[PDB]
């Protein structure tokens, strides 16, 4: 019956755990006992981007590290100019319950989505002087949580249903569908190699997928739901944040946890996680109106980016690595340097 | 100290700012409401009777205007049972219209207790509707199903003096109604700071006074907020 299947699954899990323990021979904390400390790092606000009405939920930097896009619950996507604090585009949306946005790697398209279970693709450079809807992807049954671009004709989506999807813009169908989760998948990050990508769901489990194969390859298992995930700049490790006030750093080749970032004075959860250009600083936003910077080699706090009023929702770092963009539920955007 | 195109870009940005400012008066003059409920409750009946004035969409929107003020009503119809992550979007909603079917009650009590004690859902008021009051009278009159079987504390209850029934039908129906009403208000009572209150009502799926029932509650909420702001309460 099902009893033999359960016994076989338990035996397989025990064997995998034993093998993973056998492959562990040292702790990175012991090794990292000679590197000089990063030292106290001070950061100051440079610009303040005002103009939104309701709370801001997501943002994404551009490829040229000059333009950025922001999404609000008032039903607005605003494209800013970081250097001079201007306003280029003020796209109004149909449904005012958006939860994600994405900026194309070439600068020609923008994407949005939310509770409507529809991904909208907007075109920026057109013959006329207005932005119009180009495609309305609709094949999901839950709520969109994150969207990312691979090329100008490929997009990857994550939904409230325990599925992920790869789409084709020209046709409007689903080329590949990934399944295997149990809870809601809420974050999605892409590797620089463009071949692999990670996913994090509300089951205390992180997964790695293959775009061409369409099948899972790894599974990493945290105590509560996972809110954010991000790749290491090398491409062989990643970081995850949860609601238990901890941050974890996993390595793909070793397939085992490496470090834990937590402190006894931290009770609220983590919402956004990002790295730096050199992969030395880990910036994480928390629910207690503050944001912390960790040295991802010794698990020691260094500097706080205080200055917001309500919860911090979004956080990003430019490709050129010259600024950090932070948003919150106070309808404000801050640029730190 | 600017070039020829920088000044035009600044002018365009100021025009966008003017458009955004003109797009603000329409926002604060409109009130939004979140309408929850179970499956057996008369949710669809209320939505259909509010109309006096696309196959997988996850949200539905309703517009209605009373007393020269217009409202927005939202209802979810395509999500999954788990709802601990998309309920955080509604933190700037004037009120939550809960609907309970009196004819499964403990599940509604647990849902109300969970919503009332949420961290991000504070400062949000709840308008309670106890729908399907016609069938309750017939059920209690029939006598085939006793309420004491599911609730043991029903015996040690008395009709309160402040209770005033409009129609002269029966006292037992009033006792049964006010038992449930007090059971619901007991959860709301165990709170502090007076940030959010409860507004129970006895309504049916066919009643045509629901629009004014919401209007009065919204007016009371706004008036209490303004009074508390100016140190008058």
């Amino acid at each position: 019956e099902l009893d033999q299947l359960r016994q076989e699954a338990e035996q397989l899990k025990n064997q995998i755990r034993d093998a993973r323990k056998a492959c562990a021979d040292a702790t990175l904390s012991q090794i990292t006992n000679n590197i000089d400390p990063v030292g106290r790092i001070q950061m100051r606000t440079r610009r303040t981007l005002r103009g939104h009405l309701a709370k801001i939920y997501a943002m994404h930097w551009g490829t040229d590290s000059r333009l950025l896009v922001s999404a609000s619950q008032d039903g607005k996507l605003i494209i800013w100019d970081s250097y001079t604090t201007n306003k280029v585009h003020a796209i109004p949306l149909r449904s005012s319950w958006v939860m994600t946005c994405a900026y194309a790697p070439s600068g020609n398209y923008v994407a949005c989505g939310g509770l409507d279970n529809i991904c909208s693709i907007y075109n920026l450079k057109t013959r006329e002087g207005n932005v119009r809807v180009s495609r309305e992807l609709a094949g999901h049954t839950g709520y969109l949580s994150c969207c990312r671009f691979l090329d100008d004709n490929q997009i990857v989506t994550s939904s409230g249903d325990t599925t992920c999807a790869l789409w084709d813009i020209e046709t409007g169908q689903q080329t590949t569908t990934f399944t295997g989760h149990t809870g809601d998948v809420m974050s999605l990050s892409l590797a620089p190699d463009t071949r692999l990508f990670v996913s994090g769901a509300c089951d205390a489990s992180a997964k790695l997928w293959d775009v061409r194969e369409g099948m899972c390859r790894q599974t990493f298992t945290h105590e509560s739901d996972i809110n954010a995930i991000c790749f290491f700049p090398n491409g062989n490790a990643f970081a995850t944040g949860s609601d238990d006030a901890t941050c974890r750093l996993f390595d793909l080749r070793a397939d085992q946890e490496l470090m834990t970032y937590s402190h006894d004075n931290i009770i609220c959860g983590i919402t956004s996680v990002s790295f730096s250009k050199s992969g030395r600083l880990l910036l994480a936003g928390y629910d207690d109106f503050n944001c912390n910077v960790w040295d991802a080699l010794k698990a020691d706090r260094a500097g706080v980016l205080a200055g917001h009023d309500n919860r911090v929702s979004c956080l990003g770092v430019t490709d050129d690595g010259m600024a950090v963009a932070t948003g919150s539920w106070d309808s404000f955007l801050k640029i730190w340097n | 100290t600017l070039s020829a195109e920088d000044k035009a870009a600044v002018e365009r940005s100021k025009m966008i700012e003017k458009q955004l400012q003109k797009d603000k008066q329409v926002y604060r003059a409109t009130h939004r409401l979140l309408l929850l409920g179970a499956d057996n409750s008369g949710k669809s009946t209320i939505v259909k009777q509010m109309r006096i004035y696309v196959k997988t969409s996850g949200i539905f929107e309703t517009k209605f205007q009373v007393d020269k003020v217009n409202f927005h009503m939202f209802d979810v119809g395509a999500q999954r049972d788990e709802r601990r992550k998309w309920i955080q979007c509604f933190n700037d909603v004037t009120a939550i219209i809960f609907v309970v079917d009196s004819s499964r009650l403990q599940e509604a009590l647990n849902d109300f207790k969970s919503i009332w004690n949420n961290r991000w859902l504070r400062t949000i008021s709840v308008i309670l509707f106890l729908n399907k009051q016609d069938l309750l009278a017939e059920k209690v009159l029939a006598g085939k199903s006793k309420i004491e079987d599911y609730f043991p504390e029903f015996a040690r209850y008395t009709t309160p003096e402040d209770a005033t029934p409009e129609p002269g039908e029966d006292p037992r129906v009033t006792r049964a109604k006010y038992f449930i009403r007090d059971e619901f208000l007991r959860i709301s009572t165990a709170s502090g700071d007076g940030r959010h209150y409860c507004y129970p009502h006895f309504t049916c799926s066919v009643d045509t006074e629901n629009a004014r029932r919401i209007f009065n509650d919204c007016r009371d909420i706004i008036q209490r907020m303004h009074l508390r702001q100016y140190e008058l309460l």
Partner: nanobody, 127 residues
Framework: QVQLQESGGGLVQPGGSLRLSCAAS????????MNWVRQAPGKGLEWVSD????????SYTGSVKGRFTISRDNAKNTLYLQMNSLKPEDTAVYYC?????????????????????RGQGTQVTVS
């Protein structure tokens, strides 16, 4: 990986007594609120009782009030349930569940076979 193992199931005569034990691992047991859930045949899942972090606050379903008792042992990371004077309607599958977020006062744990932080379940029958 978090897991919850139940025990204490079986068959009993009417009017008897029974014990149920829930064991947990992989998380700090002293910072979460625990609940009990049962599933009758042909019916959906229902809530029975819950116990707070320190056991100060305890609640029961009206239909089972006065006969069931709930307790926890933080040192041993264990949850207990004591049942007395069973009735023929009290046969079902039992699960011990945990609130999703620590340091909170509310949970959404009665879900149609979708909740992840739930045990396998034990069948208890009386006749």
């Amino acid at each position: 990986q978090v897991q919850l193992q139940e025990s204490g199931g079986g068959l009993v005569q009417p009017g008897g007594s029974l014990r149920l034990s829930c064991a947990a691992s992989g998380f700090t047991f002293s910072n979460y609120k625990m609940n009990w859930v049962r599933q009758a045949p042909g019916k959906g899942l229902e809530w029975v009782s819950d116990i707070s972090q320190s056991g100060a606050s305890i609640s029961y379903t009206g239909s089972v009030k006065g006969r069931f008792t709930i307790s926890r042992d933080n040192a041993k990371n264990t949850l207990y349930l004591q049942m007395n004077s069973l009735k023929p309607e009290d046969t079902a599958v039992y699960y011990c569940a945990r609130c999703p977020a620590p340091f909170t006062r509310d949970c959404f744990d009665v879900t149609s076979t979708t909740y992840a932080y739930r045990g396998q379940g034990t069948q208890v029958t009386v006749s």
